[PDB]
C-alpha cells in the first residue's frame, strides 16, 4: 500500500500529455501558416 507514489505519478504524467498536444498542434498550425502565406 505504497499509495503516495502512485498518487503522485498519475498527475505528473498527465499534464505532460496535455502539453504534448499543444506543441503538437502548433506544428500543424505552423505549416498551416506557411500554407496561408504561400498561396496568399
Amino acid at each position: 500500500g505504497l499509495i503516495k507514489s502512485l498518487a503522485e505519478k498519475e498527475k505528473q504524467l498527465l499534464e505532460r500529455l496535455e502539453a504534448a498536444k499543444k506543441e503538437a498542434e502548433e506544428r500543424v498550425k505552423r505549416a498551416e501558416a506557411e500554407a496561408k502565406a504561400l498561396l496568399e
Binding site: 500500500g1 499509495i3 507514489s5 502512485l6
Partner: protein, 50 residues
C-alpha cells in the same frame, strides 16, 4: 485469505492497503486499470465483498 487471492492474480503489480476501524480494516486494492478483472476475481474467489 484475500491477500492470497490477490497475490495470485496481482502478484506485486498491486500495492495493497488497509486502514483500521476495528472489526477489520477497510481495504483497497489498487491495480492497473487493465488489472481490474483479476483483482475483482480475487475478491470473488474469496467471497470478500465490496
Amino acid at each position: 485469505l484475500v491477500e492470497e487471492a490477490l497475490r495470485k492474480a496481482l502478484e506485486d503489480r498491486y500495492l495493497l492497503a488497509h486502514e483500521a476501524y476495528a472489526g477489520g480494516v477497510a481495504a483497497l486494492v489498487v491495480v492497473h486499470r487493465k488489472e481490474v478483472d483479476q483483482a475483482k476475481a480475487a475478491l470473488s474467489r474469496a467471497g470478500v465483498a465490496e
